[PDB]
């Protein structure tokens, strides 16, 4: 009825969205938490990973206090864009997407006491630097870091709504990983001293361990069998010169094909991995057999 | 604007990553978070034993030196974070900054340039492109220690070494 439209129209009267709540007299405190709907694919070629998140923040803006029979007020996106919201951004993000189908996938609730709750659905691609020394036996801790872009530590501070461990909740079905196993998450907070000032950074670390069975069946085991053929060369009689020459040289060719195939499906790394050292030793063994 | 960019965008999640900070004296700080693909003409004739030289050029679109001047704030410390970069395949040997006025015929226009000198890392190529070729070339010499009459053995060895070199070359062309 008329009360809703009247309260909606009269909230923004004299509201300046260019200024944060409590500017110059307190620090805007933002309680944040995340529900990971799916931990997307991890592209070790690009050293990135995708994550789909319901990312919801909450703060207090006494400028938007109101009174009425209703304790909760839903704001449409046109009005939700007309007030101050935190300028949260992901420090290690590469290309993130704010979902808009069928309408902007975001919501803004206001309590009678002026508490704002702002929920968004996001798909974030984020950098995951990797130490591939022990590949394919390696494990990684891919980070997800976010914070205010413009407001320093003395203006906006982020916090976790609940205990930090329980403030990042991963869905039971939300592990869309083929290569890795998502062992768990570690949630933390910190400070970054940038060229513009100090900033609070809320971080999560998703711990991933690569699966090894594929590389055992595709690369290690056939290479070991090729080497075993190279030693089986020794048990033929020495007078079978063409047989043993063909055996050795074709085993070398087989090892070369295996090495090429093993590496072709891997990220373009400079230094050598454990797979590379195993393959090199297998080369050395077949060459030495010949 | 960046003269040598090909595709650039300001990040826009959760909001447009812009920053306006006004200081009492009148100074204005304008910050952006930009991911840009920038052209870098590479001379790969010495590849993979090659050093590349990739620059980012910063210019004013429609102002001359009589209307605007650029400078690197903080001098050589203007650009930060290069020391913390580790590319998968390169290693940033050095980075440099230069400010200069391009004297274009109508008038002089300001310009800044941030250069990086990348040096390629070779352990990949040494362990994988050079080692098997060297080993196969060495194996091809085994034929000289086999008797002349052993035609099948020497022929099989030589031609299969040729086939292995062909396989290495073709598949390395495909991968590289």
């Amino acid at each position: 009825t008329t009360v809703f439209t009247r309260i909606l129209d009269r909230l923004l009267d004299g509201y300046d969205n260019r200024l944060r709540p409590g500017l110059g007299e307190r620090v805007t405190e933002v309680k944040t938490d995340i529900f990971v709907t799916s931990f997307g694919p991890v592209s070790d070629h690009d050293m990135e990973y995708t994550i789909d998140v319901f990312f919801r923040q909450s703060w207090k803006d006494e400028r938007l206090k109101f009174k009425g029979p209703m304790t909760v007020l839903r704001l449409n996106n046109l009005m939700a864009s007309k007030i101050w919201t935190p300028d949260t951004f992901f420090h290690n993000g590469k290309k993130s997407v704010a979902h808009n189908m069928t309408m902007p996938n975001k919501l803004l609730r206001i309590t009678e006491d002026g508490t704002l709750l702002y929920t968004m659905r996001l798909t974030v691609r984020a950098e995951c630097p990797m130490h591939l020394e022990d590949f394919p036996m390696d494990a990684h801790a891919c980070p997800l870091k976010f914070g205010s872009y413009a407001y320093t530590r003395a203006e906006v501070v982020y916090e976790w709504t609940r205990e930090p461990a329980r403030s990042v909740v991963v869905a039971e079905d939300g592990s869309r990983l083929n290569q890795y196993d998502l062992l768990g998450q570690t949630v933390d907070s910190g400070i970054v001293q940038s060229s513009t000032g100090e900033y609070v950074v809320m971080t999560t670390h998703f711990h991933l361990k690569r699966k090894i069975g594929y590389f055992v069946i595709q690369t290690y085991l056939p290479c070991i069998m090729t080497v075993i053929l190279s030693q089986v060369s020794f048990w033929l009689n020495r007078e079978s010169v063409p047989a043993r020459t063909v055996f050795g040289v074709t085993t070398v060719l087989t090892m070369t094909t295996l090495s090429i195939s093993a590496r072709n499906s891997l990220p373009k790394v400079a230094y050598a991995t454990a797979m590379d050292w195993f393959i090199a030793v297998c080369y050395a063994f077949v060459f030495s057999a010949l | 604007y960046f003269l040598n960019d090909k595709k650039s965008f300001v990040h826009g999640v959760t909001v447009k990553n812009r920053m306006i900070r006004l200081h009492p004296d009148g100074t204005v700080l304008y910050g952006l978070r930009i991911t840009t693909t920038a052209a870098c003409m590479m001379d790969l004739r010495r590849y993979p034993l090659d050093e590349q030289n990739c620059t980012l050029e910063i210019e004013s679109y429609g102002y001359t030196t009589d209307d605007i001047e650029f400078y690197w704030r903080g001098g050589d410390k203007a650009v930060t974070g290069v020391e913390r970069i580790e590319l998968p395949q390169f290693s940033i040997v050095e980075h440099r900054l230069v400010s200069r006025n391009v004297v274009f015929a109508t008038g002089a226009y300001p310009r800044l340039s941030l250069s990086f000198r990348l040096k390629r890392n070779i352990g990949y190529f040494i362990l994988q492109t050079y080692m098997p070729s060297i080993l196969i070339t060495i194996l091809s010499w085994v034929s000289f220690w086999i008797n002349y009459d052993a035609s099948a053995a020497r022929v099989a060895l030589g031609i299969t070494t040729v086939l292995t070199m062909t396989t290495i070359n073709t598949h390395l062309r495909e991968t590289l």
Partner: nanobody
Amino acid sequence: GSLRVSCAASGRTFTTYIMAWFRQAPGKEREFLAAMDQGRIQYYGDSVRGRFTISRDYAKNSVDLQLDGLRPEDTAVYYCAAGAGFWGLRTASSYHYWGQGTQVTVSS
């Protein structure tokens, strides 16, 4: 008093690794103090939040800890650690590299 403890790493470049400081008072209990990341993000323990400051010189491949507001109870052996933080960033088990350590004592 005020003090500064530096840590210089040799044999490997820890540009992409997390470099941290740990403390061990008498009694055999190792305590996380501070850590700094490739992204220059500083994590601190609650006991020493706002007192100790951690910085990294990536060009020199070193990590420094400025200690301020020392107290008699801060006497301990301080260890420098490096390594990617897997299951960690606050647990000593996640760090593969450690140093000899440095003794600190404060008298009142």
